[PDB]
Design an enzyme around this catalytic site. Sequence first.
Site, mmCIF file in Angstrom:
data_model
loop_
_atom_site.group_PDB
_atom_site.id
_atom_site.type_symbol
_atom_site.label_atom_id
_atom_site.label_comp_id
_atom_site.label_asym_id
_atom_site.label_seq_id
_atom_site.Cartn_x
_atom_site.Cartn_y
_atom_site.Cartn_z
ATOM 1 N N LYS A 24 -131.727 -29.954 -39.593
ATOM 2 C CA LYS A 24 -132.928 -29.162 -39.792
ATOM 3 C C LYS A 24 -133.871 -29.868 -40.774
ATOM 4 O O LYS A 24 -135.060 -29.993 -40.503
ATOM 5 C CB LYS A 24 -132.579 -27.754 -40.293
ATOM 6 C CG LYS A 24 -132.010 -26.812 -39.225
ATOM 7 C CD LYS A 24 -132.218 -25.366 -39.670
ATOM 8 C CE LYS A 24 -131.840 -24.360 -38.616
ATOM 9 N NZ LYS A 24 -132.236 -22.984 -39.055
ATOM 10 N N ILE A 25 -133.324 -30.323 -41.901
ATOM 11 C CA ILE A 25 -134.063 -31.104 -42.905
ATOM 12 C C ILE A 25 -134.715 -32.338 -42.275
ATOM 13 O O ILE A 25 -135.902 -32.617 -42.483
ATOM 14 C CB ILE A 25 -133.124 -31.540 -44.067
ATOM 15 C CG1 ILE A 25 -132.558 -30.308 -44.780
ATOM 16 C CG2 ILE A 25 -133.864 -32.450 -45.063
ATOM 17 C CD1 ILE A 25 -131.329 -30.584 -45.654
ATOM 18 N N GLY A 49 -130.672 -25.753 -45.386
ATOM 19 C CA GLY A 49 -129.521 -26.498 -45.912
ATOM 20 C C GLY A 49 -128.870 -27.471 -44.936
ATOM 21 O O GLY A 49 -128.111 -28.353 -45.347
ATOM 22 N N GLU A 50 -129.177 -27.313 -43.651
ATOM 23 C CA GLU A 50 -128.558 -28.097 -42.589
ATOM 24 C C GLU A 50 -129.232 -29.453 -42.398
ATOM 25 O O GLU A 50 -130.453 -29.534 -42.251
ATOM 26 C CB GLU A 50 -128.556 -27.307 -41.271
ATOM 27 C CG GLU A 50 -127.805 -25.964 -41.335
ATOM 28 C CD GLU A 50 -128.692 -24.779 -41.709
ATOM 29 O OE1 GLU A 50 -129.754 -24.967 -42.334
ATOM 30 O OE2 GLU A 50 -128.322 -23.637 -41.367
ATOM 31 N N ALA A 51 -128.418 -30.508 -42.373
ATOM 32 C CA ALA A 51 -128.894 -31.896 -42.285
ATOM 33 C C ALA A 51 -129.871 -32.154 -41.142
ATOM 34 O O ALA A 51 -130.895 -32.814 -41.324
ATOM 35 C CB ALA A 51 -127.703 -32.866 -42.199
#
Length: 343
Positions: free
Chosen positions: A111-112, A107-109
Amino acid sequence: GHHHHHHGSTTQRNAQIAMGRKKFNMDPKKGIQFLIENDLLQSSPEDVAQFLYKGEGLNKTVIGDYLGERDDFNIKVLQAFVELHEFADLNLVQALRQFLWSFRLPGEAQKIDRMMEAFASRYCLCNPGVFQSTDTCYVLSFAIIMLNTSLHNHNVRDKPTAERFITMNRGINEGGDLPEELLRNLYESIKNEPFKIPEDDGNDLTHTFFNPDREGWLLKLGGRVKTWKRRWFILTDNCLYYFEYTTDKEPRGIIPLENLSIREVEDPRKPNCFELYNPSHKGQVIKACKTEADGRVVEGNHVVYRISAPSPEEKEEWMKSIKASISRDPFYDMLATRKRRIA
Ligand SMILES: O=P(O)(O)O[C@H]1[C@H](O)[C@@H](OP(=O)(O)O)[C@H](OP(=O)(O)O)[C@@H](OP(=O)(O)O)[C@H]1O
């Protein structure tokens, strides 16, 4: 007469394997360490990558959590993980189908971004000459993801045509356009089959990647001269653009929303009004630019931008959209950044 084998007990090894998997699914760093300690896994990034890639009995959300991490080891594991995927001779949708089967996006920007940059670099290496930059592939990947959401999430009312999808992506190829039939193919593939997501709970990124940008006619009050004008508004990338006609490419004015706030206000004449204003500098003129009748561009003269909507519902919708824009989404912003770099 016939001899038989001596078969060893497999009870402890099977118990260890199951223990390791159970532990991984609670904490991937702990599960991996356990497997290494018990000689069920080697300690190199490539060996851990193979383990996650096979992912037998492994939670794919947890795989994504671990692969997205900033740690030196995890970064190497991710690169090796993406190297295990075969993207050669696949179009972008087909490659994303394969990649997005292997794990669930965190869900973390940040990480994506790391995972999609790794994907995009690999796609481009395996398919040279398709896209002019890694940025183009990255941005198109998210246009495809957004399309998946638009076509297949019932909450998105207006379904894009093939032509809308083609034109939306104008300029994406480092300033130039991708082949029309390539874009059409990507579009028709998604339309015909949504992204199949493992362990799908109905709340995956690929199903919930919405477009926050808005447009619509509203009535606006002038700055120095207090006259009401019907104007076509577009909200994108934390700026509010307004136009005399929907067909104009040249805006009547541009209001950056940074440092602004929005509030509902009563007006003696117009219903459903709200106002943009600077909460940190009361009474200060809002930075904006607009055009004059003679074609000059000058600074705005507004302390507030008072705007009237045709219904209470539209007032509420615009207020919600403008508030969301101002609060900002870190991932949307990073996407916006790559788009500017492409240009
Ligand atoms: O056309 P008339 O009735 O003379 O009034 C104009 C319009 O209201 C303008 O709106 P629009 O630009 O949408 O046409 C407004 O500019 P803003 O866009 O800055 O609100 C002007 O503000 P001042 O230039 O501040 O007077 C105002 O003089």
